[PDB]
Design a protein around this ligand. Structure first.
Ligand code: HEM
Ligand code: HEM
Ligand code: HEM
Ligand code: HEM
Lengths: 141, 146, 141, 146
């Protein structure tokens, strides 16, 4: 359960990430494929090269949905229902995979934005990414 | 973990530049701030009420330093991680009752901290090798529980 | 996230428990203390000997919290806020222990209510318990 | 894991009453219903779209039986679980890519399934011994991710 400070923290930090999200998403994805290879069995139909243009494109799609979610912290189930149908019903992603990508996202943010990545921001962001994960892996339609 | 010689180089190359005082401290604080149930184990340390209190707490830093020196000793015995962490396993299992699941959490906090310090130099590839260490430290700390 | 089919199944099976929550809750505690000894660490001040009257009484309180929870399925952060205060700020219970107690509760139920313990109800109560557990280990006010 | 002589007796004494045709299919059915992302692993088994479809699929029942006599071989070799699952471990690691966190879940599911069949006689002492078994089998099955 997100606290209010959690929200004002989550929104604050996403302000800074902001127009850079697109590439943080791709870096995060790249980080995960690379550090936890099993995750690539989910994208058999993708170029998983280091420069990959699809990975970049997909990072952008991931980061948008993350933007979307920061706007809807009081009703995440409502806002991410379509992403939930996709990940839970259709693709059937093992939830451990979310833990891996969420960790790689945090690491990405830490890398590009050390001054904004205070312990407290770290803390709210981790709750955030894990709420998001619960919604995406739940079947509630 | 048996690491490949490439991985061993990525790891040991970066370890050489880690302020073992700063970093041990930051990783522990962040552990208590981010996964706050971990505070229960550290009650005799003083006020752990606010993030700031935790990050500035002297006893937290000092313990940070031990944790990391323990990690450093780990890097020396990379191919006998389980025997190098035998004694710490018993201490954590039978004396303190810390669930094995928190070791992978501290590894993860530890990795975040290293990303935070080294930005661009913490490349995906280097990260892949640290994930392997931390995972291995965690497994070695869990030996006595199973 | 719960679907209104989960909600329907959670209510059903909890109604079938009836006036037995208390015994189930005590038995669930017994089993958790016994299968995972380190849980006992949280109760250094109790009589944990088998059959104990402090345990039966506490089971009754745990089962009431659950009945309370079943009654406010649309607003568990709201309804459980004092219990989150107790388990997250004051007692600081490792989340792992909630998984352990939840599993022992389901075994308790399965062993007393086989006809009810259908797969679909099993699936719902687990969501239920994990939803409860998240709220009680979250710091949100 | 590491069982006492008394725990071996509870575990072996119960298992003789276990219907190996029913129990494995019920264990696996429930894993797929309760932990539904586990369906991704068994696509080629038919439609798995409802609790009732999953619980009546004959491929689910038949795979279940295999899982469960595998556990039986396990019981005949408790003191070397690692050894007796080395092959199964490779299979699930390199070929199938099953995260080991799912071995724990199937283990707890099986136990719930035991409690279902045996009711009152699934006393807390007996459960305690099975929890050691399934912990140990989940662990054996995982050590090839090292
Ligand atoms: C916070 C976590 C995640 C978010 C916000 C997210 C979001 C998204 C979004 C926005 C899409 C695009 C849907 C579309 O418009 O086509 C998508 C597709 C997809 N996601 Fe995720 N996702 C997340 C986690 C994961 C994880 C952990 C996996 C597994 C490793 C995964 C696997 C996929 C796959 C395989 C696709 C379809 C790829 C394609 O064919 O184009 N996602 N996801
Ligand atoms: C990477 C994982 C970890 C490593 C390598 C590690 C290492 C250590 C070391 C070296 C000591 C000091 C032992 C001595 O020389 O006397 C220690 C003590 C201790 N550890 Fe850990 N530790 C880890 C994780 C954890 C976690 C996650 C917790 C709690 C959640 C924890 C709780 C404690 C406690 C309570 C003490 C006693 C401290 C005192 O009162 O002085 N450890 N650990
Ligand atoms: C759904 C899961 C749980 C529920 C519903 C629950 C409910 C409750 C309730 C209603 C109380 C007492 C309220 C009062 O008298 O003011 C309580 C107290 C307590 N709980 Fe839990 N609890 C749960 C899980 C756990 C777990 C897993 C642990 C640790 C193993 C735990 C440890 C404690 C402790 C140590 C107390 C203090 C009891 C005393 O000192 O009198 N709880 N819980
Ligand atoms: C924890 C106890 C488990 C045991 C004892 C076990 C045992 C087995 C056995 C005996 C086989 C078949 C090999 C053969 O027939 O020659 C198998 C294969 C397989 N396992 Fe498991 N397993 C376990 C857990 C899991 C889990 C949790 C999953 C995934 C959720 C899984 C996924 C699979 C899959 C997809 C196959 C291939 C079956 C086929 O397509 O024929 N296993 N395992």
């Amino acid at each position: 359960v997100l606290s209010p400070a959690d929200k004002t923290n989550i929104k604050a930090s996403w302000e800074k990430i902001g127009s850079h999200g697109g590439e943080y998403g791709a870096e995060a994805l790249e980080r995960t494929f690379l550090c936890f290879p099993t995750t690539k069995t989910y994208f058999p139909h993708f170029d998983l090269s280091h420069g990959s243009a699809q990975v970049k494109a997909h990072g952008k799609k991931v980061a948008d949905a993350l933007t979307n979610a920061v706007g809807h912290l009081d009703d995440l189930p409502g806002a991410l229902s379509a992403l939930s149908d996709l990940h839970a019903y259709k693709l059937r992603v093992d939830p451990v995979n979310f833990k891996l990508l969420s960790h790689c996202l945090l690491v990405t943010l830490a890398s590009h934005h050390p001054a904004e990545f205070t312990p407290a921001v770290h803390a709210s962001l981790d709750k955030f990414l894990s709420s998001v994960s619960t919604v995406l892996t739940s079947k509630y339609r | 973990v048996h690491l490949t010689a490439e991985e061993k180089a990525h790891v040991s190359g970066l370890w050489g530049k880690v302020n073992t005082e700063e970093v041990g401290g930051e990783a522990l604080g962040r552990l208590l701030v981010v996964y706050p149930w971990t505070q229960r184990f550290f009650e005799t340390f003083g006020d752990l009420s606010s993030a700031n209190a935790i990050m500035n707490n002297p006893k937290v830093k000092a313990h940070g330093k031990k944790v990391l020196s323990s990690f450093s000793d780990g890097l020396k015995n990379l191919d006998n991680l389980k025997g190098t962490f035998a004694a710490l396993s018993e201490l954590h299992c039978d004396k303190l009752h810390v669930d094995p699941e928190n070791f992978k959490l501290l590894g993860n906090v530890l990795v975040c901290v290293l990303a935070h310090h080294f930005g661009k130099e913490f490349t995906p590839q280097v990260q892949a090798a640290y994930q392997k260490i931390v995972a291995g430290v965690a497994n070695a700390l869990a030996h006595k529980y199973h």
